RNA sequence: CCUUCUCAAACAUUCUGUUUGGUAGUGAGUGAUACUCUUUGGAGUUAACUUGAAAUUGCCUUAAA
């Protein structure tokens, strides 16, 4: 089922969901390949996306067969299957499985200052953070979603990506 | 019209009624001052009410101290319409400075009988 | 002659900053322009032409 | 007769709030030339014989203060009224309002500069602070930005 | 007219002073009873006992403008040290020991020296008596020979010996001395005095500190400072 | 060219702390105050080792 | 000796009944008392000896759970002089001094946020007495948000070994409990995963014996958060 | 515009273990079932959680001039 999650607490919800298992194969799909590179360093599952080396990506996937992957790279390679960022297609994902959205089928579920301090202190984690944030922004704007367009304020999007000031 | 009652929330901690009376006495002849104190403990709620014998001075004081930044937090002084008097505000104080076996056995037996409900 | 102004532009607030200038490392680095002066003072002390601060107090005869 | 865009100054922050703002700014006075020089000499002596948190200081220079503005990095802006070139500060309140940043006006550029070492500072701003900044911002808002929001009127 | 901040500060300071005084008095009452079972401490010590010892006390200004409290005000009135920069010698005793804590925040105490006592006596002294408003200084020993000397205290040296040796006439002479009004430190204002006062004020915090603890050791400092 | 005395000591400290693990040195806030990248770290450490084996 | 038969029966009956997070998992023991400390409200945290190092499973569950607690050690000025942790199987999270807590947290929201971060509130015995004036009501309104007392001074001087051994013992022996001026007292134990029946019976036996020895307890009931009060001992003979 | 009680005692002394005493708090407001006492008046106690120091009505002067 789909889960309603506000952008202000998206990071907290994702961290809690990850902490709920700590081992089980919680498959996650991301729209932006740059974002996963920034999220991989936030664990302070392994990186598995298309932008990195093909050989290393394949080796890591084979090791994991015994994640943090994008929509495009997940197709054909394969406890929870989730999609956090907007999908590359509104229906290719519907075709256990759960969803996350809040701009608007089965059912629905029911129910960190260190990162804020570090984002302004660490240069590399700041550049990667902003890169992922605006890559997600570009994917959201470039996607021709049925009922999602440029309306939501970035004041909460920046917080969702750990950013305090609006970039 | 504005009544003589002055509503001031967000009062500084320790700003007892005596201090309010002393300070507001400078503006003129205040009528009464009262503070909302908890029954359990004398600590105030940081909001109280006071009245003035003159309605003009009542709003003049609010205008002068409308957003005065006192220590801790600013004063949220407001003036109410006609009526809304200072009725009922008590000066609570902490306090002055400073056979059975049968019932217990019966209760124990009752508990022993009730625990089977689990 | 005597008319009020219009706040047509001063009514909405921008979200994103007007410029997306990349963040320079210097803002995230301890003032290299100040380490330069620190090392200049170190060189001057090595040459002996600058007296250490302790000797200033120790020589107040 | 002054136009509505002018006379926004002269009507400035009240006595108590202005004093509180000055006291708050005094807590983050930038290191003076002598203090900076002596600190650097001490650091050199320590290193020459035998890595610190980022410092904080008030922003005063007009160019870099405006640079921080528009980027939304200015938490508070303080402006002098008696500045000789008025055009230097006519647009500053408008820019602050457009960017959604608290701003305030004071009387006396020299008094503005006395808290930042320099003889005069025209304008000043703060980038980081402990918790009284929010209360001071709220007081400044309720006493000048919202109570005198009709500055666009009158002549 | 007076601004609000002053009243609130005075109220806050008065509340703390009253709480400290009440706690100290309540603890001392239990300590005297010798129960010493559920209190912080029962013994007494001094760090830098109630045994006899002549000590000098100086009335310092501060803390903030706290309204005169009954206990401390009455204790000071007993020693008539209301005026700032005034000092008097008192005989230390177990009964008088709690008075130090009672009026610790307002006064500074310490052990004087024979030379210091002699210099203070020979350099300052008052005899407020025969209308008798005159503040006649100890100009001559004739007054000491007439009004005093019944117990053998005929000259100023006898008074010095009694004060330093805690003689029988110590109470009589001390009252007669009309304790001295010592001059204030800076005693000025204007261009240099402001900076000198600011510089001196820093030492006050590091020297005149009150821990406010009920079992705080007696605060003692050498009288050689002045 | 060579490394400065202070720079040489800092590089030696980093090498002792982590050896050849440049990734760990990158996050070593105690010594990597300037947040040197993975490339500059190795570029300086190779020259440091050239004179230290 | 305390009646072990009732404990053996309970360790199965209550487990079956319970088998929401704290209600299902949070184990505790409640002791009935006949008044306490007269007309006083001293906030002394009594300590009980535990035969098992339940802290290790407690942090293991917290590490694998969403709620990750932190251990805060309040120190003094002299203690500022990684040596405070290098000598500690057990790792201390944060160390703070009373100098900061009295001013940098004047905002009650920040104070509450700081307090809620930690659970194992540890403080020096010297400074523990002055804490309540600083941390306010919220810290003293919950057993896990109030400062525990640990002896670090030795010969009126700081001692690293004294702190280390005492903290190790507390991590593998001591268990805190408040001292309310009432007839009811609560002592939290742990989670349902804590050990097995016989081991759980042994764990509760020492706690019950220490509670009986320390004071003239009235009655003790084996309990779990909002579970039925299963009786343990009937100490009415004192009455 | 103002800074909060940052150890007192005994055995023993192994760079210090053991035992006791000393902690009277900002309020507002939610709330999962039990303890008694206290003799109808309600009195204190047992988890968990929100908070912009938020909030509408319980019967001694040299911090001078």
What is the CA G186 to C1' H47 distance in angstroms? 9
| Residue D123 to residue D106: CA distance in whole angstroms | 9
Using a 7 Å cut-off to protein CB atoms, list the covered nucleotides of chain H. Answer: 1-9, 15-18, 21-28, 32-37, 44-65
B12: nt with nearest C1' to CA? H53
Taking an 8 Å cut-off on Cβ atoms, the answer to whether C15 and A123 are in contact is no
SS3 content of chain F, % helix, strand, coil (to 5): 60, 0, 40
CA distance, residue E28 to nearest chain B CA (Å): 15
Task: Name the residue of chain C whose CA is nearest to A127's CA.
Answer: C23
Cis peptide before A70 (omega within 30 of 0): no
C-alpha to C-alpha distance for E142 and E123, rounded to whole angstroms? 17
Residue of D1, D45, D102 to mutate, testing the C interface (most C Cβ within 10 Å of its Cβ): D45
Residue reference for tokens 């760990």? F24
- Cβ-defined contact of D44 to C38 (cutoff 8 Å): yes
Based on its alpha-carbon atoms, the radius of gyration of chain D, rounded to whole angstroms, reads 18
Instruction: Report chain G's C-alpha Rg in angstroms.
Output: 19
C18 Cα to chain A: minimum distance (Å): 10
Largest Cα separation within chain D, whole Å, is 68
Q: Resolution, rounded to a tenth of an Å? A: 3.9
**Which residue does chain D place closest to A121, by CA atoms?**
D54
Q: Which residues of G136-157 are buried (b: 16+ CB within 10 A; e: fewer)?
A: eeebbeebebbbbbbebeeeee
Query: How far is C-alpha G110 from the chain's CA centre?
Result: 24
**Phi and psi based region of residue E55 (left: phi greater than 0; alpha: psi -120 to 50; beta: remaining):** beta
Phi, psi of E112 (to 5 degrees): -75, 180
d(CA A82, CA G31): 47
For residue A121, give the H/E element and its range: helix A113-121
Find out whether E208 and E108 touch, Cβ atoms under 8 Å: yes
Helices (H), chain G: 4-18, 21-25, 55-64, 83-86, 98-101, 108-117, 125-128, 132-140, 160-172, 197-214
D152/D7 Cα distance (integer angstroms): 10
Neighbours of G133 (CB within 10 A): 8
Q: What are phi and psi of G197, to 5 degrees?
A: -50, -60
Rounded to the nearest 10°, the torsion over CA A40, A45, A51, A55 is: 130
Q: Where are the alpha helices (DSSP H) in G74-192?
A: 83-86, 98-101, 108-117, 125-128, 132-140, 160-172
| Phi and psi based region of residue B10 (left: phi greater than 0; alpha: psi -120 to 50; beta: remaining) | left
Q: Do G64 and A22 touch (CB under 8 A)?
A: yes
HSE value, Cβ hemisphere, 13 Å, CA-based, for B63: 7
Smallest CA-to-CA distance from D70 within C17, C13, A164, C22 is with: C17
* Rounded CA–C1' distance between G225 and H56, in angstroms: 39
Cβ-in-10-Å burial (0-12, 13-18, 19+) of G130 comes to: middle
Closest CA relative to residue A9, chosen from A137, A159, A136, A135: A159
Look up residue A91 and give its two tokens. 């229906």
Q: Which two tokens stand for residue B37?
A: 């104190």
Interface test with E, best of B8, B10, B11, B22 (most E CBs within 10 A): B22
Q: Which of A114, E123, D143 is nearest to B68 (CA)?
A: D143
Contact (CB, 8 A) for D125 and D65 = yes
Residue nearest to nucleotide H2 (CA to C1'): E9
Distance CA B112, CA C16 (A): 68
Contact by Cβ (8 Å): F38, F23: yes
Residues G31, G11: Cα–Cα separation, whole Å: 17
Neighbours of B102 (CB within 10 A): 8
DSSP F19: T
- Measured between CB atoms, does C25 come within 8 Å of chain F? yes
C-alpha–C-alpha distance, residues D72 and G138, integer Å:
35
CA gap F22, F11 in Å, rounded: 12
What is the rounded end-to-end Cα distance, in angstroms, of chain G?
Answer: 19
**Residue closest to E212 by CA, chosen among E50, E7, E27, E8:** E27
Question: Solving technique for this entry?
Answer: cryo-EM
C-alpha distances in Å from residue E191, one per residue of A63, E92, E184, E219: 80, 43, 18, 34
Optimal mutation site among B67, B68, B74, B77, interface D, most CBs of chain D within 10 A: B67
Give all domains of chain D, ordered by start, each with its CATH number.
Answer: 1-155 (3.30.1330.30)
Residue spans of alpha helices (H) in B1-116: 17-24, 55-64, 100-114
Q: Which distant-in-sequence residues (6+ apart) come within 8 Å of C7 by Cβ? A: D152
| Touching pair E, B by Cβ (3+ pairs < 8 Å) | yes
Residue B93: how many other CB atoms lie within 10 Å: 9
CA dist B46 and G216 (Å) reads 43
* Alpha carbon distance G167, G170 (integer Å): 5
Max CA separation in chain C (angstroms):
75
- What does the alpha-carbon distance between residue G175 and residue F39 come to, in Å, rounded to a whole number? 51
Sign, Cα dihedral of A73, A75, A77, A82: positive
B100 contacts on G by Cβ (under 8 Å): 239
**CB-based contact B19 E5, cutoff 8 Å:** no
Query: Cα–Cα distance between B93 and B95 in angstroms, integer?
Result: 6
For G71: left if phi > 0, alpha if psi spans -120 to 50, otherwise beta; the answer is beta
Q: Which residues contact G35 (CB under 8 A, 6 or more apart)?
A: G181, G182, G183
Any CB–CB contact under 8 A between B26 and chain E? Answer: yes
- B42 CA to H29 C1' in angstroms comes to 18
G234 touches chain B (CB under 8 A): yes
Chain Cα centroid distance, residue A164 = 19
Closest CA to B3 of B86, B81, B64: B81
- Cβ(A150)–Cβ(A141) below 8 Å: yes
Enumerate the domain spans of chain E: 1-226
Cβ atoms G71, G122 nearer than 8 A: yes
Q: How far is the CA of G31 from the C1' of H40 (A)?
A: 28
Nearest to C9 by CA among D97, G195, G109: D97
Cα E24 to Cα E20: distance, rounded to the nearest angstrom: 6
Quick one: which H or E segment has residue A47? none
HSE-CB at G118 with a 13 A cutoff on CA atoms is 23
Chain B residues whose beta carbon lies within 8 Å of the beta carbon of residue D20: 69
Q: Confirm if E24 and E47 have CB atoms less than 8 A apart.
A: no
C-alpha–C-alpha distance, residues B92 and G18, integer Å: 46
Does the distance separating the beta carbons of C15 and A166 come in below 8 Å? Answer: yes
Backbone angles phi, psi at A47, to 5 degrees: -60, 135
**Residue G118's closest CA among G78, G77, G80, G146?**
G146
* Cβ–Cβ < 8 Å for A12, A165: no
Q: How many CA atoms lie within 13 A of A19 on its CB side?
A: 16
């Amino acid at each position: 089922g789909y889960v309603v999650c506000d952008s202000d607490k998206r990071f907290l919800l994702l961290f809690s969901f990850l902490k709920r298992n700590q081992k089980k194969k919680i498959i996650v799909f991301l729209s932006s390949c740059n974002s996963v590179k920034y999220y991989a360093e936030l664990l302070n599952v392994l990186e598995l996306h298309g932008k990195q080396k093909q050989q290393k990506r394949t080796n890591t996937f084979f090791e994991f067969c015994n994640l943090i992957c994008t929509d495009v790279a997940a197709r054909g390679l394969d406890d929870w299957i989730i999609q956090f960022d907007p999908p590359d297609d509104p229906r290719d994902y519907i075709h256990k499985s759960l969803m996350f959205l809040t701009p608007n089928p089965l059912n629905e579920y029911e129910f960190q200052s260190q990162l804020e301090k570090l984002i302004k202190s660490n240069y590399y984690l700041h550049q990667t953070a902003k890169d992922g944030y605006r890559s997600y922004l570009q994917a959201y704007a470039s996607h021709s979603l049925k009922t999602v367009y440029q309306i939501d304020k970035l004041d909460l999007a920046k917080v969702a990506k750990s950013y305090g000031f609006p970039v | 019209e504005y009544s003589g009652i002055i509503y001031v929330s967000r009062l500084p901690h320790g700003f007892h009624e005596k201090e309010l009376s002393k300070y507001f006495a400078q503006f003129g002849d205040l009528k009464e001052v009262r503070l909302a104190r908890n029954k359990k403990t004398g600590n105030s709620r940081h909001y109280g009410f006071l009245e003035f014998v003159n309605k003009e001075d009542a709003m003049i004081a609010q205008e002068s101290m409308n957003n005065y930044l006192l220590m801790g937090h600013l004063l949220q002084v407001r003036v109410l319409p006609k009526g809304a008097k200072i009725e009922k505000l008590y000066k609570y104080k902490k306090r002055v400075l400073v056979q059975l076996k049968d019932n217990m056995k019966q209760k124990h037996e009752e508990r022993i009988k009730k625990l089977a409900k689990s | 002659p005597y008319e009020p102004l219009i706040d047509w532009f001063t009514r909405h607030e921008e979200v994103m900053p007007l410029t997306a200038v990349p963040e320079p490392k210097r803002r995230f680095v301890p003032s290299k322009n100040e380490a330069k002066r620190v090392m200049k003072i170190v060189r001057a002390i090595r040459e002996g032409r600058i007296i250490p601060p302790k000797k200033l107090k120790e020589m107040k005869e | 007769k002054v136009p509505p865009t002018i006379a926004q100054f002269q009507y400035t922050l009240d006595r108590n709030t202005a004093a509180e703002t000055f006291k708050l700014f005094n807590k983050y006075r930038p290191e003076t030339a002598a203090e900076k020089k002596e600190r650097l000499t001490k650091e050199a002596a320590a290193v020459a014989e035998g890595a610190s948190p980022k410092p904080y200081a008030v922003k005063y220079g007009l160019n870099h203060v405006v640079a921080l503005i528009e980027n939304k990095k200015a938490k508070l802006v303080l402006i002098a009224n008696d500045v000789d070139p008025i055009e230097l500060v006519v647009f500053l309140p408008a820019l602050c309002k457009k960017m959604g940043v608290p701003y305030a006006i004071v009387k006396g550029k020299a008094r503005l500069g006395t808290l930042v070492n320099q003889k005069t500072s025209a304008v000043a701003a703060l980038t980081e602070v402990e918790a009284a900044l929010a209360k001071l911002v709220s007081t400044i808002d309720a006493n000048f930005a919202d109570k005198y929001d009709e500055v666009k009127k009158h002549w | 007219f007076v601004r609000a901040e002053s009243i609130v500060a005075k109220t806050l300071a008065t509340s703390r002073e009253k709480e400290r005084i009440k706690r100290v008095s309540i603890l001392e009452d239990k300590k005297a009873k010798n129960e010493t079972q559920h209190i912080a401490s029962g013994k007494d010590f001094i760090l830098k006992d109630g045994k006899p010892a002549l000590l000098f006390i100086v009335r310092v200004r501060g803390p903030l403008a706290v309204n005169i409290p009954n206990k401390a005000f009455k204790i000071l009135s007993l020693l008539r040290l209301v005026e700032t920069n005034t000092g008097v010698f008192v005989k230390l005793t177990k009964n008088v020991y709690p008075l130090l804590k009672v009026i610790a925040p307002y006064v500074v105490i310490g052990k004087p020296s024979l030379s210091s006592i002699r210099s203070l006596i020979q350099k300052r002294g008052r005899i407020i008596y025969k209308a008798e408003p005159h503040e006649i200084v100890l100009n001559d020993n004739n007054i000491v020979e007439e009004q005093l000397g019944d117990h053998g205290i005929i000259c100023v040296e006898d008074i010095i010996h009694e004060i330093a040796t805690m003689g029988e006439s110590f109470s009589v002479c001390n009252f007669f001395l009309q304790p001295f009004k010592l001059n204030r430190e800076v005693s000025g204002f204007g261009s240099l005095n402001r900076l000198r006062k600011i510089k001196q004020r820093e030492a006050e915090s590091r020297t005149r500190q009150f821990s406010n603890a009920a079992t705080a050791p007696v605060i003692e400092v050498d009288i050689d400072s002045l | 060219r060579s490394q400065s005395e202070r720079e040489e000591e800092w590089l030696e400290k980093l090498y002792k702390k982590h050896g050849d693990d440049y990734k760990k040195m990158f996050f070593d806030k105690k010594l990597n105050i300037y947040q040197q990248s993975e490339g500059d770290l190795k570029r300086r450490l190779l020259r440091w080792k050239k004179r230290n084996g | 000796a305390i009646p072990r038969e009732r404990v053996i029966k309970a360790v199965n009956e209550l487990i079956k009944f319970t088998s929401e997070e704290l209600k299902k998992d949070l184990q505790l023991i409640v002791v009935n008392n006949k008044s306490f400390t007269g007309t006083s409200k001293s906030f002394k945290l009594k300590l009980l000896n535990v035969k098992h190092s339940f802290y290790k499973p407690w942090k293991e569950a917290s590490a694998t759970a969403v709620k990750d607690f932190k251990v805060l050690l309040i120190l003094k000025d002299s203690d500022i002089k990684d040596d405070l942790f290098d000598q500690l199987g057990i790792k201390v999270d944060e160390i703070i001094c009373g100098k900061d807590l009295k001013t940098v947290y004047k905002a009650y929201e920040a104070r509450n946020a700081f307090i809620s971060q930690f659970s194992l509130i540890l403080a020096d015995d010297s400074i523990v007495t002055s804490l309540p004036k600083l941390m306010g009501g919220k810290a003293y309104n919950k057993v896990e948000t109030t400062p525990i007392s640990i002896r670090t001074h030795a010969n009126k001087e700081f001692s690293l070994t004294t702190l280390t051994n005492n903290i190790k013992k507390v991590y593998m022996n001591q268990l805190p409990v408040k001292l309310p001026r009432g007839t009811t007292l609560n002592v939290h134990l742990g989670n349902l995963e804590w050990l097995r029946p016989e081991e759980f019976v042994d764990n509760v036996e020492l706690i019950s014996e220490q509670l009986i020895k320390a004071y003239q307890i009235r009655s003790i009931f084996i309990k779990t958060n909002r579970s039925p009060v299963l009786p343990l001992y009937y100490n009415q003979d004192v009455l």
